[PDB]
């Protein structure tokens, strides 16, 4: 490649063709895989010149080369992205969204995605400069299938970055403006478009329940459930995240997920070979079992209690923690008959085995579940049968030893259990 000093000499020549050759040389240097010299390019003072080249309508090659060079600077650290914004790039890129040249409008989409992807402040600044209307205009075609694949994938990714990040979440009016286009992308048949649309929906549903409501009222839950069954892990992962976020909301929002048939996919998700899928599927189950008794009953009817026994018995420890929460929520909210059923499915032994975990939070969760199950047994007059079960599979020794445990809540709750039922 060229040296930075030679690039600087060409860019400072005031000869447009020399500037174009040098900008292309910078693009190629910034495109190399190992440590592109972003900081050297910034320190040479080239960003303002690249931003001025974005405006050269009569020289579309230098618009493209500078757009690509700035895209790659903005793909770096926050300080590097800030150098691009400080150079005036945001309005210049928004102006290029109108370019008659698809490869230039695409590169402007890409650069704005990196700028907005830096964090909430630059996301909101891109929105304030008016990026959403011209971005959405690029997708205002009757059938997305007429657009080139790579172009559509870059637009979907940039829109997903306008949905991303919190503190604050994106402006409500901006979300309302984007959502109809995002729902169209969520029904497109390209796996990368589907994955990034699913990620965008997942960001929009991670937050207060009013944000969940805005998404669920667009009718996306059935499509998310379809995507939960996809064979591509890059689609299943964000589809499950979005479903998981939705069931953190109201009981009615959770019911939409159940009504769409989500629970029928969970035998597969709760045994998926990818640890993170098992983990987030068990997290999802734990928020469903925090639901109404009729929602717990659907978990039962779908045969999922054995699957929860299974993940509590053997899984990565983070998944086992989510399983313990699922059991504590189930026993907190469930009917006596639902809790009897949980014991008949075999929960006691794997619950007791996890009391050996060197993790204070999961111990507290498990002791809470045990107390809830004892309260069910009191209503049936069967606390003795339960005490026997817990002792025979080694649980009494562990609870007895947790009396001498450091944490406050642990030794309290464990003392209580022994005093009342042992």
């Amino acid at each position: 490649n060229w040296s930075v000093e030679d690039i600087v000499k060409g860019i400072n020549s005031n000869n447009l063709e020399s500037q174009l050759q040098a900008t292309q040389a910078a693009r190629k240097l910034l495109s190399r895989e190992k440590q592109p010299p972003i900081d050297n390019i910034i320190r040479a003072g080239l960003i303002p010149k690249f931003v001025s080249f974005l405006g050269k309508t009569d020289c579309s090659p230098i618009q493209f080369e500078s757009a690509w060079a700035l895209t790659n600077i903005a793909s770096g650290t926050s300080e590097q992205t800030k150098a691009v914004v400080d150079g005036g790039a945001i309005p210049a890129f928004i102006s290029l969204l109108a370019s008659p040249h698809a490869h230039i409008s695409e590169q402007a989409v890409w650069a704005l995605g990196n700028i907005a992807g830096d964090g909430s402040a630059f996301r909101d600044l891109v929105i304030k400069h008016g990026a959403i209307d011209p971005l959405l205009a690029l997708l205002a075609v009757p059938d997305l299938s007429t657009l080139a694949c790579g172009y559509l994938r870059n637009l979907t990714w940039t829109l997903s970055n306008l949905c991303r990040n919190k503190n604050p979440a994106p402006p409500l009016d901006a979300v309302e403006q984007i959502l109809p286009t995002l729902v169209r992308l969520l029904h497109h048949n390209d796996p990368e478009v589907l994955a990034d649309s699913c990620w965008a929906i997942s960001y929009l549903t991670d937050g207060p329940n009013e944000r969940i409501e805005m998404v669920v009222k667009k009718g996306v839950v059935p499509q998310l459930v379809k995507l939960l069954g996809a064979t591509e892990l890059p689609i299943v992962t964000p589809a499950l995240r979005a479903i998981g976020n939705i069931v953190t909301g109201t009981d009615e929002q959770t019911q939409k997920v159940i009504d769409a048939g989500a629970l029928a996919v969970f035998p597969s998700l709760l045994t998926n070979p990818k640890t993170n899928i098992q983990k987030e599927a068990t997290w999802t189950m734990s928020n469903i079992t925090a639901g109404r008794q009729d929602q717990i009953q659907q978990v039962v009817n779908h045969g999922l209690v054995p699957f929860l026994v299974g993940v509590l018995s053997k899984a990565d420890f983070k998944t086992q923690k989510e399983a313990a929460w699922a059991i504590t929520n189930y026993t907190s909210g469930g009917t006596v008959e639902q809790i009897v059923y949980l014991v008949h499915c075999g929960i006691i032994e794997p619950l007791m085995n996890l009391l050996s975990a060197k993790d204070t939070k999961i111990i507290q969760v498990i002791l809470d579940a045990i107390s809830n199950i004892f309260q069910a047994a009191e209503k049936l007059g069967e606390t003795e049968k339960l005490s026997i079960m817990i002792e025979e599979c080694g649980g009494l020794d562990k609870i007895e030893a947790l009396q001498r445990h450091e944490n406050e809540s642990v030794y309290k709750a464990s003392l209580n259990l022994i005093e009342k039922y042992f």
Binding site: L30, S31, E33, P36, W68, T71, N72, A74, S75, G76, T81, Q107, W110, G113, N114, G117, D118, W157, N161, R164, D206, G207, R241, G244, N245, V247, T248, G249, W283, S286, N287, A290, W325, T328, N329, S332, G333
Partner: peptide
Amino acid sequence: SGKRKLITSEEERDPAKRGRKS
């Protein structure tokens, strides 16, 4: 009251930015 919203850390999240290599 038992709902638990998503918690993530920085290492589990994947980058929001993408450079163009070719």
